Chain length 354, copies 4
Amino acid sequence: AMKIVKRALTFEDVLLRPGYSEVLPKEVKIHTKLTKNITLNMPLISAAMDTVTEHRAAIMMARLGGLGVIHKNMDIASQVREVKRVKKSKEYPDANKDNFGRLRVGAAIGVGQMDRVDALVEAGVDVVVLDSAHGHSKGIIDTVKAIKAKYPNLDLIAGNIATAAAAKALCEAGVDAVKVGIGPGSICTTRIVSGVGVPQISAIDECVEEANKFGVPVIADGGIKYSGDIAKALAVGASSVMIGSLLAGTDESPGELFTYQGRQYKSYRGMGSLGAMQKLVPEGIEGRVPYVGSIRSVVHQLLGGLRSSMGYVGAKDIEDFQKRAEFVEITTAGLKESHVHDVTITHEAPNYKV
Amino acid sequence: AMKIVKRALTFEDVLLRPGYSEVLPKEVKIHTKLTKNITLNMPLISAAMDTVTEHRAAIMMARLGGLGVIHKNMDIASQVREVKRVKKSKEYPDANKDNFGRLRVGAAIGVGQMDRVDALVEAGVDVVVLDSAHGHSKGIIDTVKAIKAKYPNLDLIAGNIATAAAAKALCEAGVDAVKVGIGPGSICTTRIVSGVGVPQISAIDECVEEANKFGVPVIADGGIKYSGDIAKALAVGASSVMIGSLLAGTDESPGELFTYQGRQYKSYRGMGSLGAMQKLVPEGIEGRVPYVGSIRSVVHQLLGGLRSSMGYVGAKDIEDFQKRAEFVEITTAGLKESHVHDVTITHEAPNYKV
Amino acid sequence: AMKIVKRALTFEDVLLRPGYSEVLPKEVKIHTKLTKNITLNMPLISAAMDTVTEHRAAIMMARLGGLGVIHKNMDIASQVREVKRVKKSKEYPDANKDNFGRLRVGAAIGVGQMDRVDALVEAGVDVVVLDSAHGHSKGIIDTVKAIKAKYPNLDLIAGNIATAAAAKALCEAGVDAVKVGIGPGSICTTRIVSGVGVPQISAIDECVEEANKFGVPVIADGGIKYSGDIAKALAVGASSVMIGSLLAGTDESPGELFTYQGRQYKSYRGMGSLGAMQKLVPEGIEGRVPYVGSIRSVVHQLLGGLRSSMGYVGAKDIEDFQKRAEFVEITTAGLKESHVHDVTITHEAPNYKV
Amino acid sequence: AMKIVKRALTFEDVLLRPGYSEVLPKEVKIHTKLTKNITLNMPLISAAMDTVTEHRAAIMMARLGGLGVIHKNMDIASQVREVKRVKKSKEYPDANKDNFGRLRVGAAIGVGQMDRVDALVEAGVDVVVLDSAHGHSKGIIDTVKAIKAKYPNLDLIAGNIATAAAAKALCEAGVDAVKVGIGPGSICTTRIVSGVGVPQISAIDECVEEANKFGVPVIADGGIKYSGDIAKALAVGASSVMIGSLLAGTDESPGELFTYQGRQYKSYRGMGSLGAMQKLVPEGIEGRVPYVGSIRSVVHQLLGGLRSSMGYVGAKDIEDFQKRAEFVEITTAGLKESHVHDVTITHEAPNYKV
Ligand SMILES: C=C(C)c1cccc(C(C)(C)NC(=O)Nc2ccc(Cl)c(OCC(=O)O)c2)c1
Ligand SMILES: C=C(C)c1cccc(C(C)(C)NC(=O)Nc2ccc(Cl)c(OCC(=O)O)c2)c1
Ligand SMILES: C=C(C)c1cccc(C(C)(C)NC(=O)Nc2ccc(Cl)c(OCC(=O)O)c2)c1
Ligand SMILES: C=C(C)c1cccc(C(C)(C)NC(=O)Nc2ccc(Cl)c(OCC(=O)O)c2)c1
Ligand SMILES: O=c1[nH]cnc2c1ncn2[C@@H]1O[C@H](COP(=O)(O)O)[C@@H](O)[C@H]1O
Ligand SMILES: O=c1[nH]cnc2c1ncn2[C@@H]1O[C@H](COP(=O)(O)O)[C@@H](O)[C@H]1O
Ligand SMILES: O=c1[nH]cnc2c1ncn2[C@@H]1O[C@H](COP(=O)(O)O)[C@@H](O)[C@H]1O
Ligand SMILES: O=c1[nH]cnc2c1ncn2[C@@H]1O[C@H](COP(=O)(O)O)[C@@H](O)[C@H]1O
Ligand SMILES: [K+]
Ligand SMILES: [K+]
Ligand SMILES: [K+]
Ligand SMILES: [K+]
């Protein structure tokens, strides 16, 4: 009776196979494309979350080569102000800038918020990010058309989706990039609360093969725990990666440092948690992540993982990485061997914890 | 030598794939059918357990649109009295009522208890629930025929079964619904103690495809830990769901509140545990579940999960949900990504715990 | 390069499917056959281990319908004495006795110990049990022939083996039963220490299909954690089951009661552990098991599980059980649903712990 | 879109099947070949790590029949000195010696260090070990040719690799043995940090079938937790095994004993950890391993496992072991049965811990 279409695997089910290599990790190029008209010098985007990205985080992401998306849990006026501070802000040679030398910045919108879009455009946002829980819906697709009718030349990302049929529908409505991720987020409970989702490695795979038909890049959003997950998302064919938890414990994220039982924390929470929505049925939780320092130093570790990986595969840039990469499927016992095992860590590494 | 018929999967092995959607979670209809002659406004039934359902729980389930089944661990006179209080009991627009405006109520019976059935009918029970450990047996089938010979027009549910062959035999004996579940219950030890059972998602699938041949609905009984499990049971083709643990910690359940080490609990126990049967060989245990409050607020969270799910699938009602739903099979690493991960929860959600 | 012959499953990978049933658990017959010439009234044998079986344990096993095997970690004279006390020992209607009314008893031997065999025969042991770490070897097979040349009419069990090729070789040498189990024991480390073994459910399956060709029954030895494991071993086609850990915490086992941190224990240890062999390379460990009481009450729980199971399958006796049984293969998530889950046990059951 | 070439299994996914045996564990021969021109009396090599091997460890490995590789985290002069002390150093009948009676010793080199190679050769190292993170690279292959052009008769091992294509390229460049292992090490984080690696049992299998075409032996490097893992690596077709963690807690390893919370430890760390490299992106961690005593006693336990295993398979020497061995694939439940289970260890074994 039940129709089961696929056995689906996430990040910790696969490994990249090494290949012949004449590249060194320090020599590879990691520039990529955010949208079909905007490129990144580095493939990372901080997530559109009121405990991750605001102007200070967005400034550093762009200075470092990526992008930050200003969350929408604020009044239009404040979000316009946050955009204007990124755009009116060297030692940052790889900085991502628009045609006039100003740093690039993205902002989030929701369905039926044209007024917000009019104000964000006047402030000069580079890309607007149209977030829903369910991207493959009449409300989202109708909003993509309304925005494209009024602002044909504004870059518009739509999400989130997890199927080839969803990618085709958002691409046909004329978006400039698709965000993939139903359920994988650290703070997300959608898959438990509603039963719905597609494990991320399979979701990216399905959506990349469909979107490539339209020349539309795919943003892998959610479920990154380690730098190797970035390498794998990019290698499957995604063009960039959105990070929440890994950036939430930085200096630049909103919220202050606190210490609890001898460890330092910042708070981090789902945009569909009770606290962020202040009866309601949430699909996120509120919690804490360990303080990790500046964004620059987290980013440096993350890209060092990416560069290391592309060295092992022998790829000179991201699309060579994508054409060269072959994976293997691993077992639970395989995962445990990959991690640290049979040794007690006494000096924690800056890129591998607990 | 050994004959292995199937690899069988439970709830945490699958996810629902999202599909195109023009529905909103608040707009879907969740009315369904309890038996081939009785419908529910909501698909939940509280379980026939002396720590879950008695008159106060059964009143609220029906007021809210479902049903409560009065357990049989009591003398006939007391069970008749509990039935009469539900039926002699607005702000509850979706209340489930019989033709005369009285709330609907079910009661449990066992094999060879005609006298109990005669008294429950005089009190006007809507549906009697014939519980055994092994529904696919000569004793159960012979009892189904005896009751149907004397009370052709009384709705009769029989269980529990876990195979297509069992569903066909209870449907041929002329039951009005079949209860599926050998082993999956929270407090159940049958699968460990006797080696016998079928994982629940596979058991429902096998029994729905057989019972649909007779027009007989299937009640998914046991193993619901989260609201998403409800969505999946309904999507595989079951028509309603029986809940024990999730309701056992409510105000309306029998038993009083107690506090232990700073947390509030109510007790909950198997009907085949030593304590409930007071040498004996049990197939259940006695334990405690956290206090969760009123039934109305648990139910509100549970259905919010169901509604959310049907939104993601794009279904306007339960049978559209059933025809639209396609699943994926997931791995252990996939399950861990679905849950909250790499974050420490600090503000517990009302629908997702530990 | 590597040759992989089979994916192999143990007990916790399968469940018995229920079938139509006209039997009740109290009505089934559980008599079986120990060797091709000796029958048991119950299918349990206590293991030949110096912390499990000695005369008091062997007396109770036989009184209850099974057998105890006197371990060989003692001088010939003492083992003869222990045998003579079982045979010179109602309220035990199902007692297992020889032709003269004396209780049946088995003893263990090793390779090249004819003298021990001569003395055990004079004392009237019913069956000698020829234990090795590796039954499928020239030493074991040559010993089986030497014993059968001198004592054609003495029942002789040989083990342990885990392959069809091993069963054929011990059956061709003319044993009367084969013991299956490399590695599965609770206290065993062979599979970790040497890399060698076959998971038990697959090992029994392979060896039963081969031994049935000779009319030789198979004893499932090791890896029983719960009564359901017994049901499954018998259902795959094994004729009886050897138990170590589950009996080691009884009154009748050798060793005294002790209390540690408020719990009662008896000690239990591998016959290939350092302590039992008193540089050496062990394949067992020394430890403790919770005190569980009399053998009669453990046995009563174990057989209640067996009887319950045969009720669910609809089998009137063990061979009907074997011909009726169909299994399903389950997942990790399936195993967790079978166990108690989402509830905290507060009153431990007599047949299901931690 | 994604290309998945293989489902890959590590050590804890397989078991060796027993076969007919006329060997006893004490009678088997475990001599093997380190390189196509150098043999070992025992198949173990201590790893080239500044917390495992220096002159005292290398002396004992060779005295016992294997080899130690002097790590390169030191100035050329010191490494030359450490080599000279091994070679200027009975009760050790199986000692591994060169043609003149001096103990054999290996040393590690890196890319572009000809000067180090010139000095190590003058000191009379038997084999140089060319370590990289990525053996299948232009830098490694070009170094193999430079060394072979200047020192045709010097034995040269190159690693690490994890694919058949890598083995073919290092064999074509004319190495004398290949080291297999990307990621499996106890202290290694490469697979998490970069996403790259092949589970070890599959990696050895792929590389042995390719290298055998050239007559080049394969060294299984990393991921050994128990003696059974050695047996399995050798049985798949590897010719020798490199050990880090299991030897790091010995007397002979560099570093002193310390006690922490009542247990004795020595420290052990990745060669790609921050501490060993003293911004940097590590692929190893720093930690501690329990003190286990002399190397002789660890080695005695390890080989006792190997000998035990070859007894169960019925193999007289390593290549008979390789031609006889057939495996089975096991489940998670199978792994748990293999370990100690349902018993609390109270007297720890010298070859099986926690
Ligand atoms: C990132 C997530 C998950 C998220 C973010 C903020 C809020 C939510 C809340 C409200 C908890 N959850 C939903 O809206 N869930 C849902 C589910 C199905 C449909 Cl069709 C739907 O319709 C779209 C809309 O209403 O915009 C919505 C979730
Ligand atoms: C929900 C369960 C599991 C359950 C509820 C209350 C009691 C039981 C006890 C008694 C522990 N367990 C059994 O009766 N177990 C069993 C097993 C096989 C057969 Cl055929 C059987 O025959 C039917 C009958 O006897 O009504 C019965 C169990
Ligand atoms: C139940 C087990 C496992 C067991 C019981 C008591 C002792 C052992 C010790 C000695 C630890 N282990 C062995 O003998 N192991 C072994 C392994 C292979 C062969 Cl061929 C072999 O040859 C037979 C013999 O020697 O009788 C033996 C083990
Ligand atoms: C045993 C390991 C893993 C290891 C040992 C010492 C250091 C490292 C550090 C530096 C952390 N990691 C790397 O060099 N990683 C890497 C990754 C890819 C390539 Cl192509 C590469 O190029 C070769 C070279 O540079 O010699 C290197 C690792
Ligand atoms: O409340 C929520 N429910 C579900 N997903 C969320 C919620 N809040 C944020 N997300 C998504 O989760 C991602 C962050 O996941 P993370 O990188 O694993 O921490 C964000 O990019 C969002 O797409
Ligand atoms: O003692 C028992 N043994 C086995 N199943 C039981 C027992 N008591 C109740 N059940 C079943 O378990 C279900 C509750 O499971 P739960 O929803 O997971 O807590 C009830 O609907 C009963 O069908
Ligand atoms: O030292 C040992 N190594 C391996 N197996 C053992 C050892 N001692 C006893 N056994 C076996 O393990 C069985 C008991 O396993 P258990 O029932 O799981 O506790 C006995 O029947 C023996 O066949
Ligand atoms: O920093 C590192 N990263 C990755 N692998 C390492 C590192 N240091 C040592 N190794 C490898 O790990 C092996 C030891 O692994 P182990 O035997 O599991 O402890 C050594 O033989 C090296 O090949
Ligand atoms: K590792
Ligand atoms: K999640
Ligand atoms: K259960
Ligand atoms: K074991």
